[PDB]
Amino acid sequence: SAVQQKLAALEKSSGGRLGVALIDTADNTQVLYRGDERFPMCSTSKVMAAAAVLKQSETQKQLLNQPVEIKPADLVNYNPIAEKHVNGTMTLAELSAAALQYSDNTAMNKLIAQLGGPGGVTAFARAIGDETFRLDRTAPTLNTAIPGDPRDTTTPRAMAQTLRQLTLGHALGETQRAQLVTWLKGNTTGAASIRAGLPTSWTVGDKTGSGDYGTTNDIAVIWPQGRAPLVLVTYFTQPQQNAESRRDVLASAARIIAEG
């Protein structure tokens, strides 16, 4: 098709490996590029950890208000929010917001501990029908993004289908789904990614991710005013371990997609 040629064109211009999946929920049609390929999710896996805690909240109604200690042993490479509350507590809602809207790695690890380990995150993915997602490690080592390593990976197709079920479908409760949607709106880390390639009149909820080998990821759910919603997944990784981030590729992929 035409979109596949331009996506393949910008992948060649980038020197890396692009993975794209858009779900057009108007006709339930799909446009995919390397859609069944394994990519490191990096911090985009935090959506699955936040959604899994939200699923736990459908029986323990008062769970997001439960305080959780933050103390020096908990801090790792990048903790923009949990750094402010060391030797204090942080409720599971403020850690979920820190993980989604600021990509706080300590918040992720607290989300992972609440679920009983990374196997508890993968469990929730299998329960909602995702057989491809797998979380193996905690932050920050889940961002190693070594080529060929199946650890902490998924495919663009699977993550787009899952993100549709979480934010648009009914894999979560309505109070849970509205909370995750409201969280993805408040994201502060995706200005130069998928958002930069979409019309400004388009409201977007997204979660970014980045790691070694220049991995630059972004998953988004998009609501054009007057039109049926879209979910977009753009994964990108590079051959050099020390490669720099390429958020511009993610914006250009979304621009090629938005022209459809």
Ligand X SMILES: *C(=O)[C@@H](NC(=O)[C@H](N)c1ccccc1)[C@@H]1N[C@@H](C(=O)O)C(C)(C)S1
Please give the positions annotated as active site: 43
Chosen residue from 78, 151, 181, 202 binding ligand X by CB under 6 A: 78
Chosen residue from 4, 13, 60, 77 binding ligand X by CB under 6 A: 77
Helix axes 247-258, 2-14, angle to 10 degrees: 170
Number of residues that bind ligand X (CB under 6 A): 14
In which region does residue 15 sit, left (phi positive, over 0), alpha (psi from -120 to 50) or beta (all else)?
Answer: left
Which residues have a Cβ under 8 Å from the Cβ of 147 and sit 6 or more positions away?
Answer: 213, 237, 239
List the x/- string, 196-215, binding to ligand X by CB under 6 A.
------------xxxx----
Q: What residues are paired with 69 via a beta bridge?
A: 89
Chosen residue from 14, 79, 96, 105 binding ligand X by CB under 6 A: 105
Backbone φ and ψ of 184, nearest 5°: -70, -30
Rounded to a whole number of angstroms, the minimum distance from the CB of residue 208 to ligand X is 4
237 binds ligand X (CB under 6 A): no
CA 208, 209, 215: angle at the middle one, nearest 5? 130
76, two tokens: 């790792």
The residue ranges of DSSP E strands in 107-215, in sequence order, are 153-154, 203-210
Rounded to a whole number of angstroms, the minimum distance from the CB of residue 130 to ligand X is 19
Residue nearest ligand X by beta-carbon distance: 43
Chosen residue from 18, 32, 42, 97 binding ligand X by CB under 6 A: 42
Q: Which residues bind ligand X (CB under 6 A)?
A: 42-43, 77-78, 103, 105, 139-140, 143, 189, 208-211
